[PDB]
Every structure is written in structure tokens, then in C-alpha cells.
Amino acid sequence: EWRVRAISSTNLHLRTQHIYVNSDDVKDTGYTYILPKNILKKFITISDLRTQIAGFMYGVSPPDNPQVKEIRCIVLVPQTGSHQQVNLPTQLPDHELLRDFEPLGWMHTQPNELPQLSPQDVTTHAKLLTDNISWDGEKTVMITCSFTPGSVSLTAYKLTPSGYEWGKANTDKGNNPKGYMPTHYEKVQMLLSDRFLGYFMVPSNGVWNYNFQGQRWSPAMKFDVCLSNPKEYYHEDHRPVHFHNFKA
């Protein structure tokens, strides 16, 4: 029951008329995170409705405010999606400009409601934190957007020390754990910007989603970035296997 899912990708631009910051929060203690409307609107249209996709983001402080954080670049990465998890290599994106940023974002797309997070998210962040000694979990936060009907919600989260220790402690499929829990989770302050543009880094070969190319995908999988615009999901270069059976 595939082909309509390709067709459904058409309408993703419509959801961009109804983006919302899910602003039910009070913790002004959150190092308030600022995301720009341009890259978000693109990240909507390049998504795929019936699967998660994800990326990493890199930040600048405004020079006049150290604790406000502006998200300034998204790195899309080689990835294989899933309906309600995402597969990301242990390989870390790196570039001069990224190292010249302050490096703090990761975000994923949610098909639907999200009354709570996924443990795959936390374990990803915990694993990510476990690799990224630079990152520090008190600095670094996790973000979700949801394909609500005709709309998008924006919501953002932090992982507590009890969060990290849980992911550090955990190594499981973890469908109904203990410690997958609010002391382990945190909600943090984040904002949307019309005030400036950001930009995308992408893989050196462009092809970020794999899925049917998951045979090509690996958790090890060395890759690099290039500073190019993102190809959309169902772009030909992502989907070429459909053209290669019908060669004759």
C-alpha cells in the first residue's frame, strides 16, 4: 500500500501554514533555543509522512546573550528511516564551520502524537552523548516535530543526568522499561525565528535517506558532508532501484 505514500508527499507544503510552538512551558531556566523558520519549512517538505527522519544541528550563541542559543545549521546525515524509530551511524558529521559553531542539535520527525518521547530517542541522545564528549547533556537538547493533521507542532526536550545514566545503564529494545521516566526526561525552552535564515549541510554524495538502500547503509559507514541544498525524499537519486529492475 505504497504508491499513495509517494503521492502524499506532495501536500507537505500545506502543513507549513500551521506550524506551532507547543508553548505549554514555564521553565525560563531553559537556555532558550531559537530555530529559524526557513530550514524548518524545508525540513517539512523534504520529509516522508509514514516514517521518521532525523538530523543533527549546530548552533551559535548570539554575541550579546551567551545563554540564548540560535540553531544556525542542520546536518542531514546518511540514514535509514523507520515508522517510529530512526537509524543513525556511529559516524559523526564534522566540518570546519561545524567545529566553528557551538555544536548542539539533534531532531527527529514524529508521524503523529507524542504523549511521551521514544526510548530510541533517549538512547540515541545518550549514545550520542556517550560519543560526543564535547556535547555535555546539560548543554545539549533534543527536539521533535509532529505531522499533526494539516499542521506541525514543535516541541523540545532535555535529558537529565538520571536520563543519561538510564541510557548509559540501558542497552535494550526497552519497550516498557523503568527509568524511561520523567526524572530521566526533561522539557526545555525553545523558540521559532522568522528573523534570519539558516542553511543545510548534506552528505558529500547527497543521498541521506536509504531505506531500500539500507543494504548500502551501515552503522559504521564513513561519510562526509558537503554544503549543498537538500534533495527531497522521493527525488530520483534516492529511489533509483525502481528504475533498475525495469531496464528491459
Binding site: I7, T10, H13, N38, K42, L227, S228, N229, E236, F243
Partner: protein, 1541 residues
Amino acid sequence: KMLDLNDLTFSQGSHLMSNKRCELPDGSYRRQKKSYEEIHVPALKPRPFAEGEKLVSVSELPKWAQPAFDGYKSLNRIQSRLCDSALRSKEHLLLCAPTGAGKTNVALLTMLQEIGNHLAEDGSVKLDEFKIVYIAPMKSLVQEMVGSFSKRLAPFGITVGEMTGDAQMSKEQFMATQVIVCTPEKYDVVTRKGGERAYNQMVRLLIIDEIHLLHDDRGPVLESIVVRTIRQMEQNHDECRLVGLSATLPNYQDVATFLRVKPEHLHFFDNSYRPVPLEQQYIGVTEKKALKRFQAMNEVVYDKIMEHAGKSQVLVFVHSRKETAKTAKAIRDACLEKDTLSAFMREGSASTEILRTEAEQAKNLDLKDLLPYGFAIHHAGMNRVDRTLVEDLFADRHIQVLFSTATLAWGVNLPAHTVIIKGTQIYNPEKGRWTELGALDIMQMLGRAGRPQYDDRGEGILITNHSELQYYLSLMNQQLPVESQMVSRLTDMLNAEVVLGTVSSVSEATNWLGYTFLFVRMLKNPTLYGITHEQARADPLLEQRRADLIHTACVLLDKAGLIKYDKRSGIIQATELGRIASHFYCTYESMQTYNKLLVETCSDIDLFRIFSMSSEFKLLSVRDEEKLELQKMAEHAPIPIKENLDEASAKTNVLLQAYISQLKLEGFALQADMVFVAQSAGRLFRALFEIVLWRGWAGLAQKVLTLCKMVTQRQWGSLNPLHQFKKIPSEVVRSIDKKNYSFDRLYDLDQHQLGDLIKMPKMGKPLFKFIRQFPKLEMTTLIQPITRTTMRIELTITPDFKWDEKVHGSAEGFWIFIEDTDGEKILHHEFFLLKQKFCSDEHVVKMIVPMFDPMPPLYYVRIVSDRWIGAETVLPISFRHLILPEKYPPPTELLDLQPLPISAVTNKEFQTVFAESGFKVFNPIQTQVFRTVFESNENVIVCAPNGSGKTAIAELAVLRHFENTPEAKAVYITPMEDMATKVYADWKRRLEPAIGHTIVLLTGEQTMDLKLAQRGQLIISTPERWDNISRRWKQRKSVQNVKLFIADDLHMIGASNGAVFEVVCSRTRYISSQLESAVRVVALSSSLTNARDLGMWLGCSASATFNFMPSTRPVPLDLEIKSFNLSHNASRFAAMERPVYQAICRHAGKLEPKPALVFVPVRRQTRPVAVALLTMALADGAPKRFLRLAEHDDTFQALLADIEDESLRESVSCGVGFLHEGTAPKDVHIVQQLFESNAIQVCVVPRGMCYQIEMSAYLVVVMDTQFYNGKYHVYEDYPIADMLHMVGLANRPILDSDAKCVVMCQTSKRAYYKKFLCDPLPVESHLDHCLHDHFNAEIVTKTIENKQDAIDYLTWTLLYRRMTQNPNYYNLQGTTHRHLSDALSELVELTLKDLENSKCIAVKDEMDTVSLNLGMIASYYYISYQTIELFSMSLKEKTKTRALIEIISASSEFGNVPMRHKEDVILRQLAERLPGQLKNQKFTDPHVKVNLLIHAHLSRVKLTAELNKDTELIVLRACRLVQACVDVLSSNGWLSPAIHA
């Protein structure tokens, strides 16, 4: 009134039988049989020869014409009769003759008549003075005619070229071809494209083959061509002979009237003139049951073969490739069933042995099976070798019965005794259904019946339905009238006239429509066109009927958005969509659909959907028998379809994907449909690409552009580009695909690694060659911010591939796109054409992009190949280090001050200077600044728009200075010599008597100019001339005695030569400081953004810094910018011609014509444009509309008689002047006098004379904004300062209350000019590029003795100020004093190191600078250091006179001699005439030009006025170079070379 065009359209097309009865020839008889009925028409006997009618021998033709008839003894009967009309008359010719009667040789006779008009005295043909166009109905026939004429025209050196829908001739190929053979549609598209307008004027002969296509639905294409030609001939008076070739059909007298053929040239030859008399048998199947009807046809075919078996060869035509083998075998089996096969082949014949032997070599198995039996097949699916072999075997009479497709009748002249047409129904994919065979096919099939000289008579058997028998009878018995189908295409045809601009009103449309053949037919048969006899009597001219038709079409075209139609005035204006639509032959309904459905968010699925929704496919229906086959295809479709599979739109989409996927189709009709869809896809997707490009949707444009390649390459974009190289086996590339090896990495692999990767070492070297031949381009960018809102990007393109004419052709096209950070909006787009001649040179393209707030982080520069898949390169331009320039200070407000009268100047002598200049009261701008300039001695800068009388401000400073200090010297510097001449001549006339002091203009001669500066109190000079003198200021007290320095048009510092201007201005203040002598600086300029920065650099007070807005002109200026979407300038010129004339009617008005000035890019353009305007005035019936004085005015007649140029004298007699650099000053003065007196309304002036002419006009017209720079081989844009100068001439404050300006430029430049013409101009320094020569001069004078001394001087320059305002322009990384100081230190080191490397100076102790002899020579003679180094490197102990000319010609001082377009050809002709010149010289290099011109001067060869003017400049420059060589050689101690110098 709105009419229904569908009801008036003949849905039957070619089957329209307008004759109600058919009369049979004498002896015709009917035979009714059991299953079929035969109607026999006997073969007509040839008419006897008339008294005196004899065959004209080829020897009777002129000897120069005889080579075209080599191998021919005499002309035929028809050709003999037309010899006078064809060879001796230039009048239009219509030949009505039976098919096969030798029309092709009659066409050749007409060609010779034109060749005779262009035959030179030596017997050569002036191949460049004329062109011949041959219109043929089919591509196969085009190929046949090209081959024939190639043999027949070879003795004349005539080049024959094919120009078809698929075979597009390049313009260079077009130039080399004199006779072009083409299709109607291709010639229409060619004429629609406008590119060949300059070529259409050279077309002197048009031959229209099978013009009776007028009865077919394609007939309107021929009408368009003829009407366009007639309207062009009548309007332009360019004679082109029309030659119509037609069948023997009624209404030929109307066609002659339509073709303007005089009755003397109307030739009708009945069917008795057919070379072989044809007996005709018409078989009308009466069976009502379709199956029994089909069965009866099979019976007839076998029966007639047996009737002719062994008696005569039979050629059986069928409509399908599969039908050839199936029918042939079925009849063969029927021949086997009745044991009649032996009648075809006599047992033991050599032909049986031949056919069996050839069958063994035949690759086609069905042909191989049939060939032993004497049967063969011929169809387009067979290979060319087997087809040619079958053709030969039938020509040799080996094949007795041949089954073939229509292509043989159209592609091979293979006549046969007997022709049998099995069935007359053919599947029409355009109509989606089975339709009757076209008349042309029947006539071509019947044209092959009867072999001349071998058969006494031919027999033609036509098998058809009993209902259709009368139609084919009417066709062959001269009874089928040719009717017009124009109604089906009237909208599209009318659109073409609007796009060409030949029709702009309902009156013009009614006139244009009066030339159509439809109009002749409507007049001749109103009842057929839905016009009642009463209606035709009330409107005998059908004016209302035509206007109602036109009105309906205009509303439809307006409703489609192709035109703007004012229903009241009837005015029609073309839109951009109409142009695109016309250029790609798309219907208005499809464009209207596209206009409705196309959005920026369109996906790939929507693009296919929108394409499938095209109205061209409206007649495609879904067949029940094909849904199941479509079902299999739908499962294999790689792109999802949103529409239901039952919809006709979906079917079209499926077919396209299969073709791109190269899928094999089973249904023949489906396969036919696929080709039809595929053939249309190429032009339609190309049109869509232009639409999205026009709207600027970057991401969509890249997609559509990729799809165009997919259609061309028949492959999906995901496949490796190597698949495009059809010479590489697909299996090899698939082995790479199976390995998932990236294409980019293939460039790094060697041929062995590549061969090993594919496990085929033999293919490694060929692939590597193909790999290194694949188009790849490298990009480097120079980023230059101009303003806080605008940035210049200079893109240098380096080709990194090996050119191959068989792969890349003569030129390859590339699209350069600058996309925003998101890739959504096209910020800039350009078409780059890499030519084979320049495939080794790097191309630098300068472009300017707008900047938005908030600042984007980066932009993307994307270059995309126009044809090659995957040949693209993307370069992100990061703004992380972009330091935006400071916000400019607000402009000076124009105070509403009371106008100062001329009496305000206290000196009565000074009042006369302005009274003589026509001043009564000072303008508001002058009034506000008068007090600061005339009463105060402060430094002042006045930036004001052109036409505000800025020149008077300099005069006031001069008048006041000598009034107060008559003994003190004043210097006025202007960058243009022509302006200096104007100012000097006018001031010498007006100011010198009022001031009583000698005014001098410097000439450039160092010794004489020094005397002039001493003698003259007021010195007018150019910066360059003044720089040479000011160098020795320390010794020249007269320079020290200069107290006033006026720098006019200071904005020219931003031009190429501004570096000298900045230095001259900078030194003036330094000298002013060192002498304790304040030199008052008065700066006059156009409105500037950074006017205060220059004022501060000049020491002007803030109160003395006047910067008025461009809108504050005393005369309001109306600026209209019209954009032309033509990248080819020569084509663009012809597109601008008529809008200019239209602008005169619209802007300069009828009844009260006002003076209009038209600027053209070149002298060569002046005269053609003037003639075109007169031609349009003549076409309007008012040739002298532009003249305002009486023709018999004695002063006008006296002035006319004083004009030396007869063509100018003639043009002026109608009120239109034209000027050029070769016009005598007296004639120029007369034209100026006539224009100022308003005697003549229009004057044509080249861009080079804008500073030379003094005329001011109400309307200024800038015809194009580009000139050809032959050094870079690129057409360069006009400098904005020059543009402002031309616009500045739109100023007549005493005669006109307002001014109009129409700037015609390329669409890509509209935003550029729109910005800088409305807003003030930012001026930046270019001194950094010329520091060496300036640095050397001050070191020679010991002004700079150390590196710090150079730095200190630099602090006085304007550069130092601007470096702080726009660091990134100057590659500075910061605005701090350290970064400024550090960057300055590096620049000094680099400049001085270069001077040290050139041995011009010597640096002692790495700090102190010592001038060397080379520096002294360069500084003394004012020669560039680059030339002095070259002389040091090029001069040798044995250099001789010839080598000296070469070395001197290579000097940088000659690197600025202008190279004009096609000037290399004239230089080539000169080099062939001069002794000892090398034939392999680069005739496009100015150094070669100077070398050739030097030898021509020494040989006293008479040169053109342009080259003479060039020669004068060259010789003057050479004198310094020769003198400079003497000093260089003396420093080296070589006696003999110095003597040679």
C-alpha cells in the same frame, strides 16, 4: 461578434469532398462482381506536340548554366515551355503538372536565373548575396532532394543543407549554406524564432513543393510562410521569387491570385502530360459487414496479382510494418495453395540464384524467407543495408512483387509498372483513430505507377470503401477543389503575427487576413464557409465576417493571456507567454492550462500530470482492448500517477515513461502513439522550461531542465552519464552500475584501474578517453559587494574536458543559475555558450545579485549543461565574512529657493556668457549652490543628475577665480576628449573674450603641451595628458602656480581609466599642502551614494557637500525600460526595430511629432535602422511624416545640397538623419543644425559619438546596451556612466515641459539598469590595478625614496577612504586600523616587488627605493611598465626591422585597439594583399591587427575610414615606442638594433 470556430472548422480535413458530383473520363466503365465492384478509368493518351513546340537541348542553355544539366541532352516538354518563365523571368511561378512530370528540374531552372543575377564577371557565383529556400512536405523527400542537388549543383560550389524539425542547422552552418531544403513547420518555426530575420532578407527564391497541401490540415503552415513573405516583400521591397509546384487541381487560378502569379506565369498541364499514361481501377467495397468487407479486400489483392503475375512488376503499398510480412506470406500461401508461385520465378533463373544468395546475407529472417520466392518487404523497421539491397534488386527487375510502406514512395524514386494500394484507412495518432490515407500519399504512390521508357502504360489499382470511391475519383480527375484549413489554426497563426509584431491592431489583422488563401476561398465560396448568399451580398468584402473572426480569436488569445486586446481601440500587444508559445508551437489552450496549473510547489508527478493534460492530447481516447496492456505498463511505471487509469490523461503519462524507460511495446498502434507523444514531448517540455525560468522557480527549473535531457537521451537521470555515449556498450556501464561506483570517482581512476574495475582492460583506454571528453566545468568566483543591498559576482569558468566536434559539435550551451540559500528563487540566470573556437579559453562572467535583509548565509552558483545529464557544478558562496558597507548619508534636499536671475552676477561681462548660453534665470539646483561656489572659496562637491546644467558651475568657479585672481592659473580636467573639445571650443568662443586670458586645450605632445600650459591661463586637459606634465611639478613652477583644479564628471573614477584620475586629483592636494597654497577643488558629478566620502577626501565641508537625488532634475524624466528576451544581439536588434517605430507613434505622438534621438551600438547599425524606420513610415503610407519643414525651403534644399553622402542626403530628405564616425564634420554640423532647429525629427548616432554630439532631444532611445569586445569574444554591457550620459541628453527645458526615455535592453539586465538609473551610483577606486606605473613615476622623481614614503602618499588617496567603507571588495578582513595598515603594507610590497622584478627600480637595504634606467624611460615617455619589460625581454642584438614591427605591435599600448565583429575577415583579406605576411596569424588579436596595419601604412594601402582612424592612432603611439626602444637598446650597448629603430 463572437463566432464558433469549431463549427466552421472542417473536421474532415483532407477528406472534405466539396464537389457534389464527379465526371468520369471517356471510356471509363464499371464492373460489378460477387464480392467487389471495379470502376476502370482508361489511360489518357499524351497530347500531340503543338506547332513549333520542340525539346530544348541542354546545349541551348547558357554555358554557365549547362553544368547543372550534365548528362542531360534536352529538357522535357513541360520544362521547355516553362524555360522562359523559369530561366528568363523573375515573376512568381505556379506549375500545375501531373506527379512525376519532372518538376524538380524546373526548380533547378529557376535557381539558375537567380545565379545568373549573382554570377560574377569571372563566372563565380556570389554565394553570399542570395539564399534559396526549398519547402518540401516530408523529411524523407527533403533527404532525397538534398542528395540529388548535391550531384547537380557540385560544379557551382553551392552548399546544400537540410533544415528540418529534427535537423537544426547552426547559424554558422546556415551562413555556409546557400540552398536550404526544409519542411514547412521548420521554416515557420525558424521564421517564428526571429534569429534568421537578417537571413530572410537574403532569401531571393522560395520554391514550394506540393503546395496543394493547402487542402490538408497542415496547409495553414504554408499559408503563414507565403503571407509572411508577401507582407515582407511588399513592406520591405526585397524581391524574392515564389515558385509553387502543384498537382492538377481546381481553384489554381485562385491560388495564382493568392500567390500573386500573373496569368502569363500560370501553367496548367493536364493528365496527358504524365510521363507514363496511367490506367486507373477504383475498387469500392460494397460489403456492409466489416468482416466480410475485410475478407473481400484480401480476395482482390490475390486476384490482381495473378492478373499481373509474370506480366509486369507490381508494387503493393501497405500502411504497417507488420502488415508487410503478414500480407506477403498470406498471399504467398495463397499462391502456394493454388500452385501459382512458379509464375513469379522461372525455374533455374540467375535471379533465383541471386535472390537465394542475397537471402543468405539478409539479416531479416522474414525477408530471407521471402526472397527465394521473388517476394520482398521494405519498411522503416528494416536496417538500411537490407533495405538498400531490396531497392536495388527491384530496380534490376529481380523482384516481381514488392510489399512496402509509404516511405518508399516518399524516400526512393523507384517507379513500377503496377501499383496496388491495399486499403485506404490509416491509423492517425493525432486524431487517435483510423482515417483515410492522405491525397499526397496516393499521388506519391500513383506517382510511382508506370516506369518511364520501359512501360507503355502504367496501371493503378486503388482498393477502398464504396462510400469513399467518389472522393478518390474527384482527386485524380482534376475535380477535388483545394480548400483552406486556416480556421483550424487561425489563432496560432494570428499569434505568430502578433509575436512577430507584424499585426498589432484589428485593422492590421484585417489587412493581414486579407492575404490568406482562406479569404480568397471565403470570397469564392461563402456557402461553404457558413456565409449565406444574403450575408455575402451585404458584406461583399467580408470585412464584418473577418472582424468577427478576428475578434473571437483575440478574446481567446487574451483569455489565454497571450495578448492584451483592447476591445474598444482594437490595440493588440504581445506578451512573453505568446512569444514562448509561438517559438515552440504550443496551443493557447495548453498554455492556458499550464498557466492555471503551474505552481512553484509542483512535484515531478504534477509535471507529468500537467504535461499529460496538454490539449494536444485531447483527442487521445482509452481503448478497451488496451486497458489490459496498459495494466501491465501501469505496474511498471516508476513515477506514480494521480489520475485514474481509465482516464485518457493517464494513458499519455504511461506512454512517456515507457519511452524514457525504453520499454518494448506490443501494440503497434500503441507504439505509434508512443512516438507521437515522444515527438511532441521534446518541444513541449522545452517550452515549459522557459515558463518556469520566466517565473524564476529554481528547484522546479532544474527539474524540468533535467526532464528535457531525459526526453533527448531517452533515459532516466539516475542512470550513469556514460549511457549518453551511444558508442559505449550498455553492458559495460551496467557493470559499473552493478558495482555502485560513483561517476565522480571515475575521473580519478586510470585507464587500467577503470578497465580492471569492469573486468575489461580493452575498454579501459576508450572509456578513459570518453571520460575525459565528458563535459566538466570548473568554477572560481570573485565576490564584490557594491552596496549594502547589491553584490557583484564575477564567475570565471574553466573547461576541464577535451572538445570533440562529433560529440559536442561546434558549441555547447550551459545555464548558469544563482539560487538563494533555499534553492527556491532564481536570483540570476544566464545562458553560457562555450564555442569550439574558444574551448581552450577561460570565460569570465560578471553578474550582480540583490541582497536581502535578513542577510542570507550563502548563495549557490549552479552551472547546468543544456544537453548533458549529470554535467553540472554547484558552488556555495558563503557570506560568513561579508562585511556590508556603511549606510550612505541622506541626500541633500532640494530647497524651494526663488530662481536667481542672470543679473545676480555682478560682472556685466560675465552675464553675457550665460546670456549667450541661453540662460535667463538659474535653475533651482544652480540657485542653491550658486552662493557657495561664487561667493566662497571653500572646497565644494556637487553631485546632481544630468541635465541640471552642472557645467555652468565649473564656469562660475572659473569666472570668479580669474575675476579675483586673474594672474593665478586654473586647470579644468575632464575624462573625455570629446567633452574636452566641446568645452574648449565653446569656452574659447564665449568665455575667453569675457575673461581676457588665453584658454588652451592640451594635445598630448609633452613638449608642446608644456608651452600651452605656460601660455594658457585656463588649461583644459584629460587626466592622462595632465598626469605626464604634473610628474615634474617640483621643477615646473608653472605647475606650482596652478591654484584652481576642477574635476568634472568625477564619477568616472569608477571607470577603467579612473586610476589615473584619482592619482591626478590626489597629487593636486599634496602639492597644495606642500606649497602652503590652498588649491580650491570643485567637484561636479552625477548623484552619488558616497558623495561625502569623496568630499571629505577632497576637503569639502559638510555644508559644501551637495548631493541631490536623481529625481530632482529640473526637467522630469519618464524612463520606460523595455525588456527583450533574446540572448543573440544581432537577432535582438531586429526585434527592437519595430518597437522603436511604435514608440515614436506612442510616445512622440501623431499630429505633433517631437524630436527623438536613437542610439545604436555601431556604425554598421546606423544605416539599416534608419532605412527600417523609413520603411515602416513608408509602410504606414506617410514616408515623410517625420519632416516638419517644407521640402522646398531654400535653407533646407541648400542644406540638402551640402550633404556629401547621398544616402544621408536621401534620408534627411524624409526627415530622418543618421550619423557615424565616418561622417564629415560639416554634414554632422548640418544634421545638428537641422535637429536643433527641429527640421528633422529623428537622428541616429552610435554610442561612441554620444560625447561628440551636442544634440538634446525630447525622446532618447537606447537601442541595445551591449557592444562586441573582440578581445574577450563577449558582448560587453555599456558602462553605466555612458548610459547616464545618453539619458542626460534627454533635456529640453525651454522647448519641452517633460522628457521621455525608452531604454531597450536584455531582460536579464532590466533589474540591473533599473536600479542604477533610478538610485545614485556608488563609486569605487580601481587604483590597485595600476599602482606600478604610478609608483615608478614618483620614485624616478625621488618623491618616494623608501617604502614608507609610498605608504604616506597612499594616505592621500581616495582608495584609503573607501578601503574602510568596503573592505571585502578590497579583500580586507577587517575595518581596524591594523587590518587597514597591514593590507596597505602587503599591497605596497607586492607592487614594489613587481617593479623590482621588472628592473624598473632597485631596492637597497629592503627599504630604500632607487629608480633604474627602465623606470626613468617609462616615466619620461609615459609608457606602461609591462611594455618596457617586454621590450627588455624581446629586444635582441640581432633584432631587425621586421622583428621590431612585431615587437612594437605586441606592446600593451596597442592592447586597447578595438577589435570589431567580423573585423578579422577584413584583416585576413589585407594580410593576403600585403607581402610576406604569415597566413596562420590570429586575425582576432589586436596586436596582429596593429602589425598588419603598420605594414599596410608602410605600403600606403588604402584602408577604410575606420582603419584609417585606427592607423592614425597607431602611428602616433608607435613614435614613442620607437624612441623608447632606442633608450632601452642604448642601456644594453647594442648599436645595430638601435640604428634599425
